[PDB]
């Protein structure tokens, strides 16, 4: 796959490199994220990563974990993004494949994410990995248009 054939290095997110994630998020997403987002992303440990290409931080995947009463793990992908000059060369796939590999180590894992309903490019990207649109939430986002999201998910 495309993620297996790009020279990328992944690093975990910690307090010492948190500013890199904050800059990426400021550029990539119109949603403003607060301290709870950053605490959740760090607490997801191996599921949250920064991506480095040509020794520059160019993307990230940030997750939030929840343990269900069944004992199964639910993984939320909170954010996934790659800086525009470095898109289309496998970095997003590398980040997502890393999370999918971490999920395969937890039995009966399920993964959920939210995507704006007009983000046709991202929807196509996720469908390649086996994700499906399973729901729509009206008025999910406050200030952007459209305000609706798809809930996109994959079960293991």
């Amino acid at each position: 796959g495309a993620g297996r054939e790009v020279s990328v290095s992944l690093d975990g997110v910690r307090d010492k490199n948190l500013m890199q994630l904050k800059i990426l998020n400021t550029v990539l997403f119109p949603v403003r994220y607060n301290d709870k987002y950053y605490a959740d992303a760090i607490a997801a440990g191996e599921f949250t990563k920064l991506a480095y290409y040509n020794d520059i931080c160019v993307g990230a995947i940030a997750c939030r974990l929840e343990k269900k009463e069944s004992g199964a793990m639910r993984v939320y992908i909170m954010t996934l993004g790659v800086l525009a000059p470095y898109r289309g060369i496998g970095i997003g796939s590398n980040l997502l494949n890393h999370v999918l590999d971490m999920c395969s180590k937890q039995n009966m894992c399920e993964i959920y994410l939210h995507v704006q309903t007009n983000n046709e490019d991202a929807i196509k990207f996720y469908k390649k990995f086996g994700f499906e649109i399973t729901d729509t939430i009206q008025n999910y986002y406050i200030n952007i248009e459209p305000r609706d999201c798809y809930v996109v998910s994959k079960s293991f």
Binding site: F29, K36, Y37, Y76, T79, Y140, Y141, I142
Partner: peptide, 5 residues
Amino acid sequence: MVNAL
């Protein structure tokens, strides 16, 4: 892209 939280 999760909403603000």
